[PDB]
Design an enzyme around this catalytic site. Structure first.
Site, PDB file in Angstrom:
ATOM      1  CG  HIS A 111      -2.376   0.462   0.715  1.00  0.00           C
ATOM      2  ND1 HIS A 111      -3.533   0.020   1.320  1.00  0.00           N
ATOM      3  CD2 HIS A 111      -2.765   1.304  -0.274  1.00  0.00           C
ATOM      4  CE1 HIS A 111      -4.577   0.566   0.718  1.00  0.00           C
ATOM      5  NE2 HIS A 111      -4.137   1.350  -0.252  1.00  0.00           N
ATOM      6  CG  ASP A 157      -6.757  -1.261   3.851  1.00  0.00           C
ATOM      7  OD1 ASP A 157      -6.567  -2.209   4.621  1.00  0.00           O
ATOM      8  OD2 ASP A 157      -5.830  -0.620   3.337  1.00  0.00           O
ATOM      9  CG  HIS A 162      -5.140  -2.865   8.084  1.00  0.00           C
ATOM     10  ND1 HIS A 162      -5.066  -3.766   7.042  1.00  0.00           N
ATOM     11  CD2 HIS A 162      -4.860  -3.573   9.205  1.00  0.00           C
ATOM     12  CE1 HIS A 162      -4.757  -4.963   7.512  1.00  0.00           C
ATOM     13  NE2 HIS A 162      -4.624  -4.873   8.821  1.00  0.00           N
ATOM     14  CG  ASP A 212      -3.258   1.398   5.311  1.00  0.00           C
ATOM     15  OD1 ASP A 212      -2.971   0.593   6.232  1.00  0.00           O
ATOM     16  OD2 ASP A 212      -3.539   1.029   4.159  1.00  0.00           O
ATOM     17  CG  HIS A 231       2.220  -1.828   4.541  1.00  0.00           C
ATOM     18  ND1 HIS A 231       1.558  -3.019   4.321  1.00  0.00           N
ATOM     19  CD2 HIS A 231       2.582  -1.837   5.846  1.00  0.00           C
ATOM     20  CE1 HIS A 231       1.522  -3.715   5.440  1.00  0.00           C
ATOM     21  NE2 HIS A 231       2.135  -3.020   6.381  1.00  0.00           N
ATOM     22  CG  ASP A 273      -4.938  -3.689   1.699  1.00  0.00           C
ATOM     23  OD1 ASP A 273      -4.752  -4.864   1.337  1.00  0.00           O
ATOM     24  OD2 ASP A 273      -4.375  -3.236   2.713  1.00  0.00           O
ATOM     25  CG  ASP A 293      -5.580  -5.811   4.139  1.00  0.00           C
ATOM     26  OD1 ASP A 293      -6.506  -4.965   4.177  1.00  0.00           O
ATOM     27  OD2 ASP A 293      -4.434  -5.548   4.541  1.00  0.00           O
ATOM     28  CD  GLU A 349      -0.385  -4.494   1.497  1.00  0.00           C
ATOM     29  OE1 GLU A 349       0.025  -5.608   1.882  1.00  0.00           O
ATOM     30  OE2 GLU A 349       0.222  -3.430   1.769  1.00  0.00           O
TER      31      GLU A 349
HETATM   32 MN   LIG Z   1      -3.725  -0.911   3.230  1.00  0.00          MN
HETATM   33 MN   LIG Z   2      -4.947  -3.464   4.874  1.00  0.00          MN
END
Ligand SMILES: [Mn+2]
Ligand SMILES: [Mn+2]
Ligand SMILES: [Mn+2]
Ligand SMILES: [Mn+2]
Ligand SMILES: [Mn+2]
Ligand SMILES: [Mn+2]
Ligand SMILES: [Mn+2]
Ligand SMILES: [Mn+2]
Ligand SMILES: [Mn+2]
Ligand SMILES: [Mn+2]
Ligand SMILES: [Mn+2]
Ligand SMILES: [Mn+2]
Lengths: 298, 298, 298, 298, 298, 298
Positions: free
Chosen positions: B98, B121, B123, B125, B138, B225, B227, B270
């Site tokens: 990322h 995402d 997260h 970030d 990232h 992302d 994830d 990612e």
């Molecule tokens: Mn990310």
């Molecule tokens: Mn993430």
């Protein structure tokens, strides 16, 4: 209403062997016992005798693989389904690939002024010899029943078409050939692809479907292809497509249909034990039939 | 609008090797073919040359791993994305971790009065050198692009900040450090964690997101992302977090964005083949890109 | 020598439905094509018509479940196998549960002065109505063929016994009832349980088996129960027992038998697609038949 | 003897993309660290630049897919390996599909009077442009190195043949085209198929192999195709064949080779991360390299 | 409010051993650490001593397996929970099979004028000695707590009933005996089976539940049986039923409960490590406890 | 000889919780029933009370985690095993991590002139406070019993050493620290790593082991760590190491020991249900115990 089960060990509508084992895999998954538990007068009429595929070099059929044997088997099926309806019983057909829908609808449609159809599938099955990229007849039953296709298929039962486009509702679709999209678009067939299922939710999809059909038909045939469900739930199918309907969404659909009391005939197709994981798919089908016929959690 | 694909084989923004193989994994998953099928004028500009990590003892600092190499690679990326935008093409960036979002946003933001951002995402970030518990860049790209962080990252492209907090919408979040929650809370960043996705449903999350942005931006960048999706759907990621977005929810989100026509740039990051199961994650990314660019079931 | 395949869709010898699907699962796994590839004159005679189990409360048989239907089906099988042998062809029988061995041996034994038997199985199948803890006839075929059991089973074909105990060799056994251990011990049947396989290795087990039989018989029937292999290799069986023979050990066994040229008849039993993982077990069986009939790696 | 690692990100010798990621998947599996732990002076020379395949329609021979780029890349590899051997270092080549064996052997063979070769693979790789059913050059390296095949491949390095048939030993073979069996038979190449491994055991296979080669060669090249191992142990390969060598058998073979001190060059090929399960295959390759270079349990 | 954890290593309410390991599997899944992270004053009071079941032959009632020891253990549990509530702490009980709900409710109910109960389970647990098809007391706790059943169970704590039927809400039900449906119907117990969850969605189910209870109770006890979740999410349970609540739906329910601040006592039961996959079920229970006690994603 | 089972719910010899559940997991796997079936007079003495770990800062030292609690528990174990031996019974100890071997050996060794030991494990467990990279006492029991280690462990039972190095045989080893290799090498301990198992085969390893010990001891203790088996066969262990002993190899080893009649005491350790797949590991341990005590296939 009493139920009559007719098995159709057909795999000639496509190329992967094993779907002819679908009827007995479902019997072994306990379909009779499941329905008897619901106090139904259930009768198992056995299986329709299916032919052997004649040598490729002999009969004309590549855009229409196994045409004569598929047509022949479907004529017998239509006759058998017609008999059951005449006896005042509910015809429950177990497949077998989806090409058997041609025979089931042929035996049922003649008995209704405006028969509706709920096509629960990952595919549209509206190909013709001209649009089919494979020549597999199991991808043409809906088009053929609407009167579009080879006369050997459209004329089964001695009449055509079986149903009208405005009386069909596709649910769970996520894999259509461009020709099929055109067909659906042009014939004005109501369709809920996975986009609508995700966006509106299964409850709304079913409410709209039920209201739409109840409003313009005098009977409704449920043609359920197990590949409508996600491959993680129903792995034993010849043409799996990811991002499908969940086990729970399918039960909800069946429970809502049972509640609406609009289903007058049904068929569960594409169960292939040879591509399955310990009869999981046949078991799913039986559980769904249970819900369709009134089985409730409370 | 024609598309230009830029690969950024970057893994320096985190510690797990393999994410640098993400651009080609997606290429091998058929990204070009998928988009060409949709009648797009698609061009593959290749990959950004990424340097080798300098010894940590010599780099920026303990809190910013591989700072100079990450920064240099992002400078080149910004330059490349800038040229693509000037050519009137849509920049489609394939990662790579990322941290590349810093370069992508640097190359795109200058071209818009009020660029919006959808950060899909698990997260947020939004860490900085001071708040980062790992020093992995990232986990800092969103904060840096908002002008918060090390000048080596915030100043990429020669300007700062790239976007305003009120023009960002986080979707699918389920793993935030306390400092990140504070950052999001204080900067007033719009966010839909898994709680809101479960409570409101993805359709409402997307409708609100689209309306929110369409109402205050003149372009929207999608920074996805993998994830963000549940590890069961997207296993090949360096920081998996259970209880994620489903395959279907993600396709719905992409289809709704495509329908809204608000996405002006995008990046898929990612993807780590080395942590994947038979390129499943790269394949998911490609299918999602298909939906984003207009692919419809019907 | 030309081969004639006879399918016996029998599941009445035990209680788990689905093993009646074994013959066609093996046909779909490609048995015909596999053998044709080896330049054999292969003929598929179809399946033996099997009956339906009469109601429990009616016919006397709990220590001998489905006795009459199992006996009837085995009489037909014996007749069919006898015909094939008379035509100078090798009878290859596909099951179906192991109770079919009664019919296969009945049709074959009469043609040899001293027919040998290699019983490749996790079980001994030497139970009688008196020693059987389940009443399943598929656990009694070896005892019945040796002339021990219900006359309805021991007299199939009009003669008894089919073979002598000194001409039998059990391989891969790891699950015997105490009565069976006594039977094996007392009748002096040669047996290699998994203890001997592990201790001596499959090569020695087969060398000793081949030398033992070649030295005292004028024909050898291979009766292979897929449950002889470990459940990880052959999961689609009704009575799985862990710690079984490997896929490689089984191929070695078949290759060594092919090399010895002592096998004059064979049957592959207990394949149940309904308990399998994507026809893996039927596929294993076909691969083994390939090796048995001369297929070599070099 | 110091080691020099040369990566060859080649996938042009076959049709499945991803095997070009094999060199770095092995680097990420920790090959450098593993070998350094053994006190080796290890050097990583990077990767050989591989050209892009030109359009199939404008290629020279369909029986030899990507000939020019495969040959081109193999010339560079030969020069690189030649350089390493001249420096008195052991060349450790990481692939990449098996077609790279043409360059490795070209760079090594010139340095020995009688170079031996252990081809650890599920396949023989002895096809030529005339016998190849696919045109995939990764199925031709052993034949080409023996001087049989297209001059573009047999003349790499400016000389031919690289080795003599009596100095080659195939281990683990279980998939040979009829033309290949004829080739192996006629050239008198020593071969231990899975039949011999099962029958004799890996220990005996290795003792015979080592004794055979040690007796007539002055150097031995190990060309290990990960597909030699069973797909359950090494899933990330393009041409998997069931019934393979176990993880343990492979470690034993490497340990016995290390003990004999006969291996003077080696290559680990066909690792495809894109077809793998979380880098399992690359990890297996690295563990085997560890054993090959002297790593001992005690 | 401070929390007091009481473990009840009980498996006597059913027949599958291992659920007695549930309290410590949850402790090992990090329950203390999870809750401490939320700034709670958490105390672990240890486990309730459970007696050994006496010989079945010398027991008092077959319809009530292990009655004496279950009752005995529940008396101790009631006293322990009573003590905790008197100290002004929140009793968090870890099981152990569901029969422990009899003791938990006995220790809590006396402290409230109108205690509400949310029974999150795949089952109703409203059987009595007369209706039970098994005699397993873990299928009787809800009925017993409402005052219906054996006095040994209904009188635990010295009073009955603990709660009123109009103050109970069943969530996630999908497996009810006919007697239980009759019980639920006749007592007027509010119930949301999987049909309602699918139809209305978890958000609506929870809003209605919370509003219903908040409106007529002065405390609410959460009795969560891990089998309420789908076996794919919570495999380590003794009575799994497919088509269950998802991990996400369960987190949403816990988060909405936390938000409402209506839960005054709770218990997580039926966790069986011995039937689990690497403590997955205990981990799920701990994550849900986290959400219940206020853990938020943002 | 009658058997007495002593459970030692110990997990203090290492850091992963759950191994303390090993004694009851094996009980639930049916250990008593298995041995009773073999006509043994079997007695279950219950579990040794294990204390709670004292704060590391107060304990023995950083290199010996939980020293006093491990030592105290081993003192009680030694006393219990001593009494069992004095009663003329066979002590069968169920763990619990391997540190319990210190107590088992302490209670048994005093009764023999020259006690032999078969250490079936993936590890050597010959570390000391000085060589241990973790401070986990479960990696020191063999060394301590040989008199090398902290006096708190070497002096258990009041005497030292319990056994001589020349009377120990390690089997299945594949993970030794360099110091351990040095210890084994210098003390002259007989060892069969996986290299020797693969090269010689388990039959030869066992024959040599039995002959070696029978020739110089008057009793043999079997100390079996389930991690000796491959993680695929025994997943529920704290320190799994790939490339282990198979299920079959282990049964052969137990059957050969049973046949030799040299085993005078035994313990099965490291079973962790919390890291297991449905009690598979505990079940493997019980099956192995069955073989050890005379259970035969025939
Ligand atoms: Mn990310
Ligand atoms: Mn993430
Ligand atoms: Mn269909
Ligand atoms: Mn379909
Ligand atoms: Mn059998
Ligand atoms: Mn058997
Ligand atoms: Mn190869
Ligand atoms: Mn190969
Ligand atoms: Mn319950
Ligand atoms: Mn329940
Ligand atoms: Mn150990
Ligand atoms: Mn160990």
């Amino acid at each position: 209403k009493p139920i009559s089960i007719i098995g159709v060990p057909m795999d000639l509508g496509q190329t992967r062997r094993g779907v002819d084992m679908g009827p007995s895999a479902m019997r072994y998954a306990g379909v009779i016992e499941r329905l008897e538990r619901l106090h139904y007068d259930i009768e198992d009429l056995g299986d329709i005798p299916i032919g052997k595929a004649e040598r490729l070099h002999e009969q004309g059929d590549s855009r229409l693989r196994n045409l004569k044997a598929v047509a022949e088997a479907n004529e017998k099926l239509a006759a058998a389904v017609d008999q059951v309806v005449q006896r005042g019983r509910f015809p429950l057909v177990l497949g077998g690939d989806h090409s058997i829908a041609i025979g089931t609808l042929a035996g049922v449609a003649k008995h209704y002024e405006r028969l509706g159809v709920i096509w629960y599938d990952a595919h549209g099955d509206v190909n013709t010899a001209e649009t089919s990229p494979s020549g597999n007849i199991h991808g043409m039953p809906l088009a053929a029943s609407l009167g579009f296709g080879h006369p050997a298929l459209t004329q089964i039962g001695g009449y055509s078409p079986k149903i009208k486009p405005e009386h069909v509702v596709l649910i769970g679709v996520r894999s259509l050939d461009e020709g099929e999209k055109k067909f659906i678009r042009e014939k004005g067939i109501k369709i809920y692809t996975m986009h609508e299922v995700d966006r509106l939710g299964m409850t709304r999809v079913m409410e709209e479907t039920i209201a739409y059909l109840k409003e313009r038909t005098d009977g409704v045939h449920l043609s359920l292809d197990l590949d409508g469900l996600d491959p993680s739930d129903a792995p034993g199918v010849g043409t799996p497509v990811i991002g499908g309907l969940t086990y729970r969404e399918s039960h909800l659909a069946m429970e809502m249909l049972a509640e609406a009391q609009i289903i007058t005939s049904a068929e569960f197709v594409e169960v292939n034990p040879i591509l399955d994981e310990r009869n999981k798919t046949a078991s799913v089908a039986v559980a769904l039939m249970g819900s369709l016929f009134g089985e409730k959690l409370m």
